[PDB]
Amino acid sequence: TSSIVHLCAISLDRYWSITQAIEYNLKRTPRR
């Protein structure tokens, strides 16, 4: 039970950072 979460806690983070940088620039606006 606890051996999962943790894990899950890894595989997610990885994508966390990414996401955070995406949206960043995603629909942005841009503006533009």
Tell me the three state secondary structure of residue 2: helix
Polymer length of the chain: 32
Tokens 């990414």: give the residue.
Answer: 18
Tokens of 11: 């595989």
Give the whole-angstrom CA distance, residue 28 versus residue 14. 23
Where would I find the H helices in the chain? 2-11, 13-20
**17: which 2 tokens?**
């950072």
Sign of the alpha-carbon torsion through 1, 4, 21, 25: negative
CA distance 29 to 4: 39
CA pair distance 11, 5, nearest whole angstrom: 10
For this PDB entry, the determination method is: NMR
8, amino acid identity: C
The token duo for 22 is 């995406």
